[PDB]
């Protein structure tokens, strides 16, 4: 039975525990002896699996903390709509989305920092935003700043709604454990009720607000003549000169949908498959049709799993039937148990669920980044070159942090929530029973690719210096063509309906006005060599993270590693030395390798777009790119990455003093600080530093100013966590300040 059970008032509501920090752990509540109590109070505040032991009381803390998180997104989402309401040039940008630059977030007149208020066109002085908010509100049908303001008001009352529901579901009506454990019913309402009714609600907005507004904005009605979006429903004769093949009446226009004469909708539900050549984005008839085929497919697929009416699938039976009397005979190697005892894994532990939901949301956010540049979805997005790169670079970094989190909680599951009772000889036992064959062949293909992607950049670097340009892996020397990726560019242009979907594959140059939106991205030897840099760096990022998941239980070094914990520094200087043997220090080492992997994805993007896609078109048809075919000849030596990319494209962030890009020149140099500052914590150890506090504590005990919270150096784990939190901060903000000073000096 799939009934609802709650608990009436389980937790009191008082400020008595706010006066006692560290109440959740028993060793933190007994007092603050040293300053390690300060740091342990924040490293354990959200470890809800160590505050209590029962999954009924843990899962109420999980459910009530999502509500307080959703009430934090709604504060930030009401700050993007409020800044577009009061502190922006959204009026001047909507009239002319080519000459006027998108800007919110004006700067106060103090400390001489009003030099950052550069000229945005039309007498507006502010900071050129690269978040794509202006190109997104135009696609939603926003026309005046009153509609942006009462979205920001409507989100603040949606933040107080989501914040009241976290107090209500922890202090008044907290659910029970058998309400959280019916994950078949949860998948019915998230597929159909959330992803199906969300893309059914949005395709009703598109054809009633976005499709009328973006039709009249292409005729240039100049924001007096355009109607407010309720006047396309209250006045249905107004949407009849647009889209005349339908009827557009309250009851008279819907009946082509029920009588299945869907040819009445074929003018505003198209399958054109291309870019709008006036704006640059996709057709909003093509997008509104897309959400209708998504809402059908999701509401259908939300009736797959069995709730209390008998009919439906059950994941408990589908998982337990994949044993090996019934498999395909070439993948019948996975156990006579199969993966019985695996529905008990993803229901009785939240870390097992978090490791899949982070690696899927991480890999989704990189698929999203690869699609919003090749199929640009918003009007005037693709020609705002500062927005195209800052949305690819954003969701690649966001979607790569979540991958490392998907491999952190796949290691907290093994140390804490793994049970050898329910996992005997199933599909997870059999992986730990051969984990020196997974890691041996992973550490070979990381080694095979490191020689065949990086040492081919050292072969080209030596032939170019020798004066032998015919001996190196060029398009002019020893050609390495992407034979299987030049062929898929041939398939996706020979299967066109009549318009060539995704001009990145081939055919046509979308050059909507001034600058060029999309062009074919051809692939040569410089694209063969750089896709194997990506294949190499992804595999070592996997090898570091997979070694921390398989060897989180035990090893040949420390066979009792799951008793030392997940987050422990070492097991002493024995066995030669066993520092960073934990599963935490493979998340820590996979964060540098996520960094090195994703910083070359955003450098391959930023240079291939400038040299082979972006640029300006004249009055003949030839395109002069931003760097001018530079990736084909000089991105094959990593002296060419040093000279033609890092040195030659940072002339906009170096010479950005006394101008309006002045903060990008400071964040560039403030970024190099935090990277070099990170190396104090990474390279040194805490026994130097604890033995240095003791000589400084002495100078306070001498002058009688010693504290009773006794000053201790940071932990071994805490000293490694702040050495990677600074490397991955000052290494990102120096790339953020270079990607944006280069592209907001052009546009």
């Amino acid at each position: 039975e799939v009934r609802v059970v709650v608990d009436n008032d389980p937790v009191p509501t008082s400020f008595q525990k706010w006066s006692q920090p560290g109440h959740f752990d028993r060793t933190l509540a007994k007092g603050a002896k040293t300053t390690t109590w300060i740091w342990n109070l924040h490293a354990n505040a959200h470890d809800f699996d160590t505050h209590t032991s029962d999954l009924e009381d843990i899962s109420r803390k999980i459910f009530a903390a999502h509500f307080g998180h959703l009430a934090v997104v709604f504060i930030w989402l009401s700050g993007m709509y409020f800044h577009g309401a009061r502190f922006s040039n959204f009026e001047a940008w909507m009239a002319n989305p080519t000459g006027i630059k998108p800007s919110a977030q004006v700067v106060w007149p103090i400390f001489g920092q009003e030099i950052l208020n550069g000229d945005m066109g039309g007498g507006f002085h502010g900071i050129q935003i690269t978040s794509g908010l202006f190109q997104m509100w135009r696609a939603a049908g926003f026309t005046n700043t009153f509609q942006l303001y009462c979205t920001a008001i409507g989100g603040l009352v949606m933040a107080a709604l989501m914040l009241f529901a976290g107090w209500f579901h922890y202090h008044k009506r907290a659910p029970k454990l058998e309400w959280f454990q019916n994950t078949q019913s949860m998948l019915n309402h998230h597929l159909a009720g959330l992803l199906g009714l969300g893309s059914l609600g949005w395709t009703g907005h598109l054809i009633h607000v976005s499709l009328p507004t973006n039709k009249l904005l292409d005729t240039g009605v100049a924001l007096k003549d355009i109607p407010l979006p309720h006047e396309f429903i209250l006045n249905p004769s107004l949407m009849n000169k647009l889209y005349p093949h339908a009827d557009w009446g309250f009851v008279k226009g819907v009946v082509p949908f029920f009588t299945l004469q869907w040819g009445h909708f074929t003018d505003f539900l198209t399958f054109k498959g291309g870019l709008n050549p006036v704006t640059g984005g996709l057709w909003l008839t093509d997008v509104a049709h897309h959400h209708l085929a998504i809402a059908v497919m999701f509401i259908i697929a939300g009736h797959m799993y069995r709730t209390n009416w008998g009919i439906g699938h059950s994941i408990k039976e589908m998982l337990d039937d994949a044993r090996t009397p019934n498999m395909l005979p070439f993948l019948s190697f996975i156990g006579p148990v199969g993966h019985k005892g695996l529905f008990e894994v993803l229901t009785t532990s939240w870390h097992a669920q978090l490791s899949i939901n982070l690696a899927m949301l991480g890999s989704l956010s990189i698929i999203i980044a690869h699609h919003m540049y090749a199929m640009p979805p918003y009007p005037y997005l693709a020609t705002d070159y500062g927005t195209v790169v800052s949305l690819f670079t954003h969701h690649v970094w966001i979607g790569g942090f979540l991958i490392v989190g998907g491999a952190a909680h796949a290691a907290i599951y093994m140390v804490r929530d793994y049970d050898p009772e329910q996992n005997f000889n199933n599909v997870l036992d059999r992986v730990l029973r051969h984990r020196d064959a997974i890691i041996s062949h992973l550490a070979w293909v990381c080694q095979f690719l490191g020689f065949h992607s990086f040492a081919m950049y050292c072969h080209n670097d030596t032939m170019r210096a020798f004066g032998r340009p015919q001996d190196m892996f060029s398009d002019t020397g020893i050609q390495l063509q992407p034979v299987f990726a030049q062929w898929l560019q041939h398939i996706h242009t020979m299967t066109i309906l009549h318009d060539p979907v995704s001009y990145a594959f081939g055919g046509g140059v979308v050059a909507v006005g001034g600058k060029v939106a999309m062009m074919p991205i051809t692939l040569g030897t410089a694209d063969f060599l750089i896709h194997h840099i990506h294949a190499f760096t992804i595999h070592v990022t996997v090898l570091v993270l997979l070694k921390g998941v398989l060897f989180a239980r035990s090893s040949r070094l420390i066979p009792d590693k799951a008793n030392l914990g997940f987050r422990f520094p070492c097991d002493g200087p024995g066995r030669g030395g066993t520092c960073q043997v934990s599963a935490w220090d493979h998340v820590f080492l996979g964060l540098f390798w996520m960094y090195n992997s994703l910083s070359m994805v955003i450098f391959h993007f930023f240079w291939k777009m400038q040299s082979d896609v972006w640029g300006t078109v004249g009055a003949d048809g030839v395109v002069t790119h931003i760097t001018g075919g530079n990736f084909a000849t000089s991105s094959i030596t990593n002296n060419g990455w040093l000279r033609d990319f890092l040195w030659a494209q940072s002339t906009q962030v170096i010479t950005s003093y006394n101008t309006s890009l002045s903060a990008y020149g400071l964040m560039f140099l403030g970024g190099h600080f935090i990277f070099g500052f990170s190396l104090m914590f990474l390279f040194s150890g805490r026994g130097y530093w604890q033995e240095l506090i003791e000589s400084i504590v002495w100078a306070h005990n001498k002058l009688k100013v010693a504290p009773a919270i006794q000053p201790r150096a940071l932990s071994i784990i805490h000293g490694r966590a702040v050495g990677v939190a600074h490397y991955l901060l000052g290494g990102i903000v120096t790339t953020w300040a270079f990607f944006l000073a280069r592209m907001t000096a052009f546009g």
Binding site: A32, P109, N701, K702, L703, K704, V705, A708, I709
Partner: protein
Amino acid sequence: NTTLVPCYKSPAFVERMKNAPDSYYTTKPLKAYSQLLCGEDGLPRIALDRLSLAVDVAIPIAIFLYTAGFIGWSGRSYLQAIKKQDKAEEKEVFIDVPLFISCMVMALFWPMAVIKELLAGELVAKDEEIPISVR
């Protein structure tokens, strides 16, 4: 004595006042920099002379070093207050602000309060009461 001419007759500083914006940052703070010594590139230097900049250099000393030893003396007299109450482990996290303000207005006259503990020998702790290492 040096080549640091004042910014009144420096021939490279008057161009910084010739072509300039107005708002609040390059008009009134620029004519107040005119009595400052500046080199051959029109940038107001900070030299140390005998009497012409005797108190002109001693205002940033005496203004800072008072409220350097005002933060330090109210932090020292607060840590000594909460250790005679025998509750210093818990009063350092939860700051007892009626006492920290009381130990702040006792530090407003700290130069005539430090030397009342130097001659009384109570500023420093004696070497046989301070924890050390094996030396």
